[PDB]
Amino acid sequence: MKYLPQQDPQVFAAIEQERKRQHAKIELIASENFVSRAVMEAQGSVLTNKFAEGYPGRRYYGGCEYVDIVEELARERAKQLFGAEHANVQPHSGAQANMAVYFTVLEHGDTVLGMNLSHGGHLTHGSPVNFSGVQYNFVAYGVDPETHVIDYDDVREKARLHRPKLIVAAASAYPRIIDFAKFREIADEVGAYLMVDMAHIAGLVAAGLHPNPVPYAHFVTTTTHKTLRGPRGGMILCQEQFAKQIDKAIFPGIQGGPLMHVIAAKAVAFGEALQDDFKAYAKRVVDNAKRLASALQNEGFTLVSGGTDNHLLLVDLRPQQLTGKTAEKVLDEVGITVNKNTIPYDPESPFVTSGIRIGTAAVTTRGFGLEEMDEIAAIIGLVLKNVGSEQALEEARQRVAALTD
Amino acid sequence: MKYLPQQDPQVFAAIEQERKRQHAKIELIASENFVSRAVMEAQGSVLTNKFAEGYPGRRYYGGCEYVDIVEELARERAKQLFGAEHANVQPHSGAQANMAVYFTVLEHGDTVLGMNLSHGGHLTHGSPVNFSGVQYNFVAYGVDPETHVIDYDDVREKARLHRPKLIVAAASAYPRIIDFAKFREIADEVGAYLMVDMAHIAGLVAAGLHPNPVPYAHFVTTTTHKTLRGPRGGMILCQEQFAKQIDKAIFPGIQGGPLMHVIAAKAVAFGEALQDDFKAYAKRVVDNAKRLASALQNEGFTLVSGGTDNHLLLVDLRPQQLTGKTAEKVLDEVGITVNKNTIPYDPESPFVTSGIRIGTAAVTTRGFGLEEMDEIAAIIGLVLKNVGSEQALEEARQRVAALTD
């Protein structure tokens, strides 16, 4: 940076602390990642100066010839990546992508069926304090109490009983592969649309490491950040038949001007994901998650669903008589960043929880491999088995420092 | 840029075309501006990597100590700038800021009173193709057919007849000062909340060149771009009594994670606006608009409301028997960027229009002054009085080039 340090010492100092924090800590929050310098440069471009309401070649303002190229590159690369017939790369966030799909197919009060929030579903999949649960009538399907795998007979029964107009699949804390084919079969049985929110797994889908929802869902929403490793933002994918309606939902429906600099950054991120080395990266993410899962089990931890098929895992801390809140706090003390997370059938509130959620996308981006997974698990074991020992915590702190250098 | 040119030749080439376009053209779109290099650097920072759901000191994820400093700097500087008791700097856009206020005080189907869209009101103030008009029952007040000034007796009559729960004031194409005191008086008479959408005029308000809505409105929404000259995004200001509810509307109500890099950029922009030289800038914006208005009248153009009190003006093209669409197209041919705009009581559709809207914020940022205003008006006169003369258009093109260098 050249101009910020001189113009705004306070903001620069805080940014610099954050940069140094990102390097020093072990980031295990499952949605987190580190974008490339090219992605950041795109976001820091003069494209922030351009008003571009509308779509490429169909703008409501002049001078968009070049930002049109940028947006079309984003859309075409997204289509290549996911085999979708249409992309909308304007959503400001995953929340806004979801909001737009809901706005397209639902009327106020319509019934929607989504994953139980305390079993891994997202806030925007029907929380009563979120617009989704306030605007629409959400019902929930659950995971099996033993296997923690989505109960597809429960999905079907809920669908048949409640007759939702829309079924939502996908999750913020579900460590196994989702069967999109079964979701579409159930949707077809009850005449519901299927929306898949692939935010967490989008990078894995792009790398062919998780089944692609595109062939099965009427609408697929996603973040551009997370495993896809792009800038913060949203995207919607759909078949040509819904394209006009989806685009109209985003604008003039729910947003105004798009963030063209962020859209440039999306294009960059999609370009990266199209490369062979991104595929290799994504495989290491999943390999690392499996290794970390195995190593945590070796430490004596119980994992929700007994392991992982993807980038993330959930530790059920009940056997150690710890809450997620307690575990999250003490790991913070040693430089490991996780989040408390409800586990299926959690006896604790979502503000306390019986679990921690862990993901490997961020550490994999930093070049961590299988050995590092073994060591991260050993440190977590050391810490959580010795919550009252400052000497143990200091040892952990030194081991974390050894990992981040 | 260092990394983007190597990583993504296609995206870089398009960005570079856009950069060169921004310099070559005369930007007169009233919402447009050019941000500082410091603002762009903040947006291009590693803060895009940080998940920060919640608010400073009350986050739902760990590691936010430094992004908390950044967000608090944004909020405190906004409060200083506008004399507001509370700021929410998380809205992704002006649309989302509006959406959140609506979500806070309204139920589905509630009546809202806003400015007539064809008299200068915004899409999010009740368009039937926007969420605002679909979710809530919007009624409209108008401007006087002669003076083009808001008819406050019409505001009052509409309020008394329709009994709105909320009254919205503010506009995208209104060239005169809005009387927030009268809006609040009317609101009080009918027991309605008052929301002011100051997006267009926020920079002028910060510089003390337009009356401040904060003392009069329960809620003030704004963009951070436009006359405020910040990054693209939204903000809400309100009294302490609404703070908790407003914050809850943004999250978990309508958004998820905030864009922390954009919030850093907002802080930077607010820092700039707090400086004396921003006040001088804003005065030049308004001085330039008045000069341009006068010079356009000297050319024989009729202006909506007969002039301007702010950064923008509207040309009523009926005396020249031109549509806004025709004028916008031919000015595009010579390198002047305007937008067609409906004028009050326009006999044309919003897709054709009888007007063009012009603003001086962008050219003022580039250092244009009164002489340049005179020349811009003379070029517009040359072009619009000679739409069929390629020689005139080539002369205009050369004069535009002389201005941008």
Short mmCIF file of N, CA and C in Angstrom, two decimals, chain B residues 80-221:
data_model
loop_
_atom_site.label_atom_id
_atom_site.label_comp_id
_atom_site.label_asym_id
_atom_site.label_seq_id
_atom_site.Cartn_x
_atom_site.Cartn_y
_atom_site.Cartn_z
N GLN B 80 -19.72 11.55 13.79
CA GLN B 80 -19.16 12.91 13.77
C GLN B 80 -19.63 13.72 12.56
N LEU B 81 -19.60 13.08 11.40
CA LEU B 81 -19.90 13.71 10.13
C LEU B 81 -21.34 14.21 10.07
N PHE B 82 -22.25 13.40 10.61
CA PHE B 82 -23.68 13.65 10.43
C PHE B 82 -24.44 14.00 11.71
N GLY B 83 -23.72 13.99 12.84
CA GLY B 83 -24.32 14.26 14.15
C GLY B 83 -25.39 13.26 14.53
N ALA B 84 -25.21 12.01 14.11
CA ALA B 84 -26.16 10.96 14.41
C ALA B 84 -25.76 10.24 15.70
N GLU B 85 -26.75 9.66 16.38
CA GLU B 85 -26.48 8.96 17.64
C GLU B 85 -25.98 7.54 17.42
N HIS B 86 -26.36 6.97 16.28
CA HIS B 86 -25.98 5.60 15.91
C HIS B 86 -25.76 5.48 14.40
N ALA B 87 -24.76 4.68 14.03
CA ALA B 87 -24.52 4.34 12.63
C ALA B 87 -24.45 2.82 12.47
N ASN B 88 -24.97 2.35 11.35
CA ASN B 88 -24.77 0.98 10.92
C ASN B 88 -24.10 1.05 9.56
N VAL B 89 -22.86 0.58 9.50
CA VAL B 89 -22.02 0.74 8.30
C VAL B 89 -21.91 -0.56 7.50
N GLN B 90 -22.73 -1.54 7.87
CA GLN B 90 -22.71 -2.87 7.22
C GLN B 90 -23.55 -3.03 5.94
N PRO B 91 -24.55 -2.14 5.68
CA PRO B 91 -25.38 -2.42 4.49
C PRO B 91 -24.53 -2.55 3.22
N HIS B 92 -24.78 -3.60 2.43
CA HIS B 92 -24.02 -3.86 1.20
C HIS B 92 -24.24 -2.80 0.11
N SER B 93 -25.33 -2.05 0.24
CA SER B 93 -25.77 -1.11 -0.79
C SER B 93 -26.82 -0.17 -0.20
N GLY B 94 -27.16 0.89 -0.94
CA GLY B 94 -28.27 1.76 -0.58
C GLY B 94 -29.59 1.00 -0.58
N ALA B 95 -29.75 0.08 -1.53
CA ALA B 95 -30.96 -0.77 -1.59
C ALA B 95 -31.11 -1.57 -0.28
N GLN B 96 -30.02 -2.20 0.16
CA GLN B 96 -30.05 -3.00 1.40
C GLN B 96 -30.25 -2.16 2.66
N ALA B 97 -29.71 -0.94 2.68
CA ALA B 97 -29.98 -0.01 3.78
C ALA B 97 -31.49 0.28 3.88
N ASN B 98 -32.09 0.62 2.74
CA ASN B 98 -33.54 0.85 2.66
C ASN B 98 -34.32 -0.39 3.06
N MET B 99 -33.93 -1.54 2.50
CA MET B 99 -34.58 -2.80 2.80
C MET B 99 -34.62 -3.08 4.31
N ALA B 100 -33.50 -2.82 4.98
CA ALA B 100 -33.36 -3.03 6.43
C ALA B 100 -34.27 -2.10 7.24
N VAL B 101 -34.35 -0.83 6.86
CA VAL B 101 -35.24 0.09 7.57
C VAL B 101 -36.69 -0.37 7.41
N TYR B 102 -37.07 -0.72 6.18
CA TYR B 102 -38.41 -1.23 5.94
C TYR B 102 -38.69 -2.46 6.79
N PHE B 103 -37.72 -3.37 6.83
CA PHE B 103 -37.83 -4.62 7.61
C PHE B 103 -38.00 -4.33 9.12
N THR B 104 -37.46 -3.21 9.58
CA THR B 104 -37.46 -2.84 11.00
C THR B 104 -38.85 -2.38 11.44
N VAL B 105 -39.48 -1.52 10.63
CA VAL B 105 -40.70 -0.84 11.10
C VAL B 105 -42.00 -1.27 10.44
N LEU B 106 -41.89 -2.01 9.34
CA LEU B 106 -43.06 -2.41 8.57
C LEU B 106 -43.34 -3.90 8.61
N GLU B 107 -44.62 -4.23 8.49
CA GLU B 107 -45.07 -5.58 8.19
C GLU B 107 -45.49 -5.62 6.73
N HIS B 108 -45.46 -6.82 6.15
CA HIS B 108 -45.90 -7.05 4.79
C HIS B 108 -47.27 -6.40 4.58
N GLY B 109 -47.38 -5.58 3.54
CA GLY B 109 -48.66 -4.96 3.20
C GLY B 109 -48.93 -3.59 3.79
N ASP B 110 -48.09 -3.17 4.75
CA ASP B 110 -48.20 -1.84 5.34
C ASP B 110 -48.12 -0.75 4.28
N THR B 111 -48.84 0.34 4.51
CA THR B 111 -48.83 1.47 3.59
C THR B 111 -47.61 2.39 3.85
N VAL B 112 -46.94 2.76 2.77
CA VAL B 112 -45.79 3.68 2.82
C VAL B 112 -46.03 4.79 1.80
N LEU B 113 -45.63 6.01 2.15
CA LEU B 113 -45.78 7.16 1.28
C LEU B 113 -44.40 7.61 0.84
N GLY B 114 -44.15 7.64 -0.47
CA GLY B 114 -42.83 8.04 -0.98
C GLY B 114 -42.96 8.98 -2.16
N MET B 115 -41.83 9.53 -2.62
CA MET B 115 -41.88 10.47 -3.76
C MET B 115 -42.22 9.72 -5.04
N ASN B 116 -43.13 10.30 -5.82
CA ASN B 116 -43.47 9.78 -7.15
C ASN B 116 -42.20 9.45 -7.94
N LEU B 117 -42.10 8.21 -8.41
CA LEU B 117 -40.91 7.75 -9.12
C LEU B 117 -40.62 8.56 -10.37
N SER B 118 -41.66 9.00 -11.06
CA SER B 118 -41.44 9.80 -12.27
C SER B 118 -41.23 11.29 -11.98
N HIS B 119 -41.27 11.67 -10.70
CA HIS B 119 -40.97 13.05 -10.27
C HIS B 119 -39.61 13.13 -9.55
N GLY B 120 -38.91 12.01 -9.47
CA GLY B 120 -37.57 11.99 -8.87
C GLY B 120 -37.32 10.96 -7.77
N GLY B 121 -38.37 10.22 -7.39
CA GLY B 121 -38.24 9.17 -6.37
C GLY B 121 -37.41 7.99 -6.87
N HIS B 122 -36.91 7.19 -5.94
CA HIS B 122 -36.05 6.04 -6.27
C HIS B 122 -36.84 4.75 -6.45
N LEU B 123 -36.26 3.84 -7.22
CA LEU B 123 -36.80 2.50 -7.41
C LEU B 123 -37.23 1.81 -6.11
N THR B 124 -36.41 1.95 -5.07
CA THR B 124 -36.66 1.30 -3.79
C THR B 124 -37.65 2.08 -2.93
N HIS B 125 -38.24 3.13 -3.51
CA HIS B 125 -39.28 3.92 -2.83
C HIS B 125 -40.65 3.55 -3.41
N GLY B 126 -40.82 2.28 -3.80
CA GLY B 126 -42.15 1.78 -4.20
C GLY B 126 -42.39 1.31 -5.63
N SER B 127 -41.34 1.15 -6.44
CA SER B 127 -41.55 0.59 -7.79
C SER B 127 -42.24 -0.78 -7.71
N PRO B 128 -43.27 -1.01 -8.56
CA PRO B 128 -43.98 -2.30 -8.55
C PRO B 128 -43.15 -3.49 -9.05
N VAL B 129 -41.96 -3.23 -9.60
CA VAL B 129 -41.05 -4.32 -10.00
C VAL B 129 -39.88 -4.44 -9.01
N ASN B 130 -39.91 -3.62 -7.97
CA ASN B 130 -38.91 -3.67 -6.90
C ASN B 130 -39.53 -4.31 -5.66
N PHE B 131 -38.70 -4.90 -4.79
CA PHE B 131 -39.25 -5.49 -3.57
C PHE B 131 -40.13 -4.49 -2.78
N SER B 132 -39.77 -3.20 -2.81
CA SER B 132 -40.49 -2.19 -2.03
C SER B 132 -41.99 -2.12 -2.38
N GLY B 133 -42.27 -2.11 -3.69
CA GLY B 133 -43.66 -2.00 -4.19
C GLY B 133 -44.42 -3.31 -4.15
N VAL B 134 -43.69 -4.41 -4.09
CA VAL B 134 -44.26 -5.76 -4.06
C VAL B 134 -44.60 -6.15 -2.62
N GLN B 135 -43.73 -5.76 -1.69
CA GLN B 135 -43.83 -6.16 -0.28
C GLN B 135 -44.72 -5.23 0.56
N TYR B 136 -44.75 -3.96 0.16
CA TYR B 136 -45.49 -2.93 0.87
C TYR B 136 -46.41 -2.15 -0.07
N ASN B 137 -47.40 -1.49 0.53
CA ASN B 137 -48.37 -0.77 -0.25
C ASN B 137 -47.96 0.70 -0.41
N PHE B 138 -47.24 1.00 -1.49
CA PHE B 138 -46.74 2.36 -1.68
C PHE B 138 -47.75 3.30 -2.34
N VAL B 139 -47.88 4.48 -1.73
CA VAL B 139 -48.59 5.62 -2.32
C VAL B 139 -47.57 6.74 -2.55
N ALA B 140 -47.87 7.66 -3.46
CA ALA B 140 -46.89 8.66 -3.90
C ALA B 140 -47.36 10.10 -3.73
N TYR B 141 -46.44 10.98 -3.37
CA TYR B 141 -46.67 12.43 -3.44
C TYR B 141 -45.88 13.00 -4.62
N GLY B 142 -46.30 14.16 -5.11
CA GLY B 142 -45.73 14.72 -6.33
C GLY B 142 -45.17 16.11 -6.15
N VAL B 143 -44.51 16.58 -7.21
CA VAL B 143 -44.06 17.96 -7.30
C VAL B 143 -45.12 18.80 -8.03
N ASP B 144 -45.09 20.10 -7.78
CA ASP B 144 -45.96 21.05 -8.47
C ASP B 144 -45.66 21.03 -9.98
N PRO B 145 -46.72 21.03 -10.82
CA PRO B 145 -46.51 20.91 -12.28
C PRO B 145 -45.79 22.09 -12.94
N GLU B 146 -45.75 23.23 -12.25
CA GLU B 146 -45.10 24.45 -12.76
C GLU B 146 -43.69 24.64 -12.18
N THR B 147 -43.59 24.60 -10.86
CA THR B 147 -42.35 24.91 -10.18
C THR B 147 -41.42 23.69 -10.03
N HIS B 148 -42.01 22.50 -10.18
CA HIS B 148 -41.34 21.21 -10.01
C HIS B 148 -40.77 20.99 -8.60
N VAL B 149 -41.25 21.78 -7.65
CA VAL B 149 -40.88 21.65 -6.25
C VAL B 149 -41.91 20.72 -5.58
N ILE B 150 -41.44 19.88 -4.66
CA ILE B 150 -42.33 19.01 -3.89
C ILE B 150 -43.50 19.83 -3.37
N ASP B 151 -44.71 19.33 -3.62
CA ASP B 151 -45.93 19.95 -3.11
C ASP B 151 -46.21 19.40 -1.71
N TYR B 152 -45.87 20.20 -0.69
CA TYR B 152 -45.97 19.74 0.70
C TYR B 152 -47.42 19.56 1.17
N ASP B 153 -48.34 20.30 0.55
CA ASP B 153 -49.77 20.08 0.77
C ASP B 153 -50.24 18.75 0.19
N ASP B 154 -49.65 18.34 -0.93
CA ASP B 154 -49.89 17.01 -1.48
C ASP B 154 -49.32 15.91 -0.58
N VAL B 155 -48.09 16.10 -0.09
CA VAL B 155 -47.51 15.15 0.88
C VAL B 155 -48.49 14.97 2.05
N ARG B 156 -48.95 16.10 2.60
CA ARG B 156 -49.85 16.09 3.75
C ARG B 156 -51.19 15.41 3.44
N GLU B 157 -51.77 15.70 2.28
CA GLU B 157 -53.07 15.14 1.91
C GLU B 157 -52.99 13.63 1.71
N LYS B 158 -51.94 13.19 1.02
CA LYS B 158 -51.68 11.76 0.80
C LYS B 158 -51.48 11.05 2.14
N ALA B 159 -50.71 11.67 3.03
CA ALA B 159 -50.47 11.13 4.37
C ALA B 159 -51.80 10.98 5.13
N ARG B 160 -52.63 12.02 5.09
CA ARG B 160 -53.87 12.03 5.86
C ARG B 160 -54.91 11.06 5.30
N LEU B 161 -54.93 10.91 3.98
CA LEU B 161 -55.86 10.02 3.30
C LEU B 161 -55.48 8.55 3.47
N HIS B 162 -54.20 8.24 3.21
CA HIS B 162 -53.73 6.85 3.16
C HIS B 162 -53.20 6.29 4.48
N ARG B 163 -52.91 7.18 5.43
CA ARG B 163 -52.44 6.80 6.77
C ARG B 163 -51.25 5.84 6.73
N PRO B 164 -50.15 6.28 6.09
CA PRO B 164 -48.98 5.42 5.98
C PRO B 164 -48.36 5.18 7.35
N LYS B 165 -47.73 4.02 7.52
CA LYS B 165 -46.97 3.72 8.72
C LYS B 165 -45.61 4.42 8.67
N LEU B 166 -45.14 4.67 7.44
CA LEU B 166 -43.83 5.23 7.16
C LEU B 166 -43.96 6.22 6.00
N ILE B 167 -43.32 7.37 6.14
CA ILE B 167 -43.15 8.32 5.02
C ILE B 167 -41.67 8.35 4.64
N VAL B 168 -41.39 8.26 3.33
CA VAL B 168 -40.01 8.36 2.82
C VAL B 168 -39.83 9.70 2.10
N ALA B 169 -38.74 10.39 2.43
CA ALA B 169 -38.34 11.59 1.70
C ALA B 169 -36.95 11.33 1.13
N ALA B 170 -36.63 12.06 0.06
CA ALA B 170 -35.36 11.95 -0.67
C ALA B 170 -35.55 11.34 -2.06
N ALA B 171 -34.54 11.53 -2.91
CA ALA B 171 -34.76 11.42 -4.34
C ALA B 171 -33.47 11.13 -5.09
N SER B 172 -33.63 10.59 -6.30
CA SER B 172 -32.53 10.34 -7.23
C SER B 172 -32.40 11.44 -8.29
N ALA B 173 -33.45 12.23 -8.47
CA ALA B 173 -33.41 13.27 -9.52
C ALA B 173 -34.22 14.50 -9.14
N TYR B 174 -33.95 15.02 -7.95
CA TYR B 174 -34.63 16.22 -7.46
C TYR B 174 -33.59 17.32 -7.21
N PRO B 175 -33.64 18.40 -8.02
CA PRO B 175 -32.59 19.43 -8.00
C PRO B 175 -32.73 20.54 -6.94
N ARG B 176 -33.70 20.42 -6.03
CA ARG B 176 -33.88 21.46 -5.01
C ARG B 176 -33.74 20.90 -3.60
N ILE B 177 -33.54 21.79 -2.64
CA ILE B 177 -33.41 21.40 -1.24
C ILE B 177 -34.74 20.81 -0.77
N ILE B 178 -34.66 19.70 -0.03
CA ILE B 178 -35.83 19.05 0.54
C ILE B 178 -36.05 19.58 1.96
N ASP B 179 -37.31 19.88 2.29
CA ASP B 179 -37.63 20.48 3.58
C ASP B 179 -37.96 19.36 4.56
N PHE B 180 -36.94 18.86 5.26
CA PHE B 180 -37.14 17.72 6.18
C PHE B 180 -38.03 18.06 7.37
N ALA B 181 -37.99 19.32 7.79
CA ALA B 181 -38.84 19.80 8.87
C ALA B 181 -40.32 19.62 8.54
N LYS B 182 -40.72 20.00 7.32
CA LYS B 182 -42.11 19.81 6.89
C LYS B 182 -42.48 18.34 6.79
N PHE B 183 -41.57 17.51 6.27
CA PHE B 183 -41.81 16.06 6.26
C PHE B 183 -42.07 15.52 7.67
N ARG B 184 -41.25 15.93 8.64
CA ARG B 184 -41.43 15.45 10.02
C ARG B 184 -42.75 15.97 10.64
N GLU B 185 -43.09 17.22 10.36
CA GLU B 185 -44.37 17.79 10.79
C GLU B 185 -45.55 16.95 10.28
N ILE B 186 -45.51 16.58 9.00
CA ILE B 186 -46.56 15.77 8.40
C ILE B 186 -46.58 14.36 9.02
N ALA B 187 -45.39 13.77 9.17
CA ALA B 187 -45.25 12.46 9.82
C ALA B 187 -45.88 12.46 11.21
N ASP B 188 -45.56 13.48 11.99
CA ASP B 188 -46.09 13.66 13.34
C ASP B 188 -47.61 13.79 13.33
N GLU B 189 -48.15 14.50 12.34
CA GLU B 189 -49.60 14.69 12.26
C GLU B 189 -50.36 13.38 12.11
N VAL B 190 -49.78 12.45 11.34
CA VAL B 190 -50.44 11.17 11.02
C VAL B 190 -49.87 9.97 11.79
N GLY B 191 -48.92 10.23 12.69
CA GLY B 191 -48.27 9.19 13.50
C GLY B 191 -47.46 8.20 12.67
N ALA B 192 -46.79 8.71 11.63
CA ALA B 192 -45.90 7.89 10.80
C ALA B 192 -44.43 8.10 11.16
N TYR B 193 -43.61 7.06 11.00
CA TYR B 193 -42.14 7.23 11.04
C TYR B 193 -41.73 8.04 9.80
N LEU B 194 -40.62 8.77 9.92
CA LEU B 194 -39.99 9.43 8.77
C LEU B 194 -38.64 8.79 8.47
N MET B 195 -38.49 8.31 7.24
CA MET B 195 -37.20 7.83 6.73
C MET B 195 -36.74 8.81 5.66
N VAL B 196 -35.48 9.22 5.73
CA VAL B 196 -34.91 10.04 4.67
C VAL B 196 -33.79 9.27 3.97
N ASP B 197 -33.94 9.09 2.67
CA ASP B 197 -32.91 8.47 1.84
C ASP B 197 -32.05 9.59 1.22
N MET B 198 -30.93 9.89 1.87
CA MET B 198 -30.08 11.00 1.42
C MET B 198 -28.94 10.60 0.47
N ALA B 199 -29.04 9.42 -0.14
CA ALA B 199 -27.97 8.89 -0.99
C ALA B 199 -27.32 9.94 -1.91
N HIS B 200 -28.13 10.67 -2.66
CA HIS B 200 -27.57 11.62 -3.62
C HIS B 200 -26.84 12.80 -2.96
N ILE B 201 -27.37 13.26 -1.83
CA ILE B 201 -26.94 14.52 -1.25
C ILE B 201 -26.06 14.36 -0.02
N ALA B 202 -25.67 13.13 0.31
CA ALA B 202 -24.97 12.88 1.57
C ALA B 202 -23.67 13.69 1.72
N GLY B 203 -22.92 13.85 0.63
CA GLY B 203 -21.68 14.65 0.66
C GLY B 203 -21.97 16.11 0.96
N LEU B 204 -23.06 16.62 0.37
CA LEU B 204 -23.49 18.01 0.57
C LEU B 204 -23.95 18.23 2.02
N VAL B 205 -24.72 17.29 2.55
CA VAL B 205 -25.09 17.30 3.97
C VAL B 205 -23.84 17.34 4.89
N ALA B 206 -22.86 16.48 4.61
CA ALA B 206 -21.63 16.42 5.39
C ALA B 206 -20.86 17.75 5.38
N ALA B 207 -20.95 18.47 4.26
CA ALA B 207 -20.27 19.75 4.08
C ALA B 207 -21.11 20.97 4.55
N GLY B 208 -22.31 20.71 5.08
CA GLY B 208 -23.22 21.77 5.52
C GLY B 208 -23.82 22.60 4.39
N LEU B 209 -23.97 21.98 3.22
CA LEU B 209 -24.48 22.68 2.04
C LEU B 209 -25.91 22.26 1.67
N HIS B 210 -26.45 21.30 2.42
CA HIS B 210 -27.85 20.93 2.33
C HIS B 210 -28.27 20.67 3.77
N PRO B 211 -29.50 21.08 4.15
CA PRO B 211 -29.99 20.77 5.50
C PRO B 211 -29.83 19.30 5.86
N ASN B 212 -29.43 19.05 7.10
CA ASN B 212 -29.22 17.70 7.60
C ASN B 212 -30.55 17.04 8.03
N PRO B 213 -30.88 15.86 7.45
CA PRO B 213 -32.13 15.18 7.83
C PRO B 213 -32.07 14.51 9.21
N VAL B 214 -30.87 14.30 9.74
CA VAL B 214 -30.68 13.50 10.96
C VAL B 214 -31.57 13.98 12.14
N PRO B 215 -31.59 15.31 12.42
CA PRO B 215 -32.43 15.80 13.52
C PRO B 215 -33.94 15.59 13.32
N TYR B 216 -34.35 15.35 12.07
CA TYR B 216 -35.78 15.29 11.70
C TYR B 216 -36.33 13.90 11.41
N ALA B 217 -35.45 13.01 10.97
CA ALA B 217 -35.84 11.66 10.56
C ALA B 217 -35.58 10.66 11.68
N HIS B 218 -36.48 9.69 11.82
CA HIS B 218 -36.26 8.53 12.69
C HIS B 218 -35.12 7.67 12.12
N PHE B 219 -35.10 7.56 10.79
CA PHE B 219 -34.08 6.80 10.09
C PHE B 219 -33.57 7.58 8.91
N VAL B 220 -32.25 7.59 8.74
CA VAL B 220 -31.66 8.14 7.53
C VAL B 220 -30.85 7.04 6.87
N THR B 221 -31.12 6.78 5.60
CA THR B 221 -30.31 5.84 4.83
C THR B 221 -29.48 6.60 3.81
#
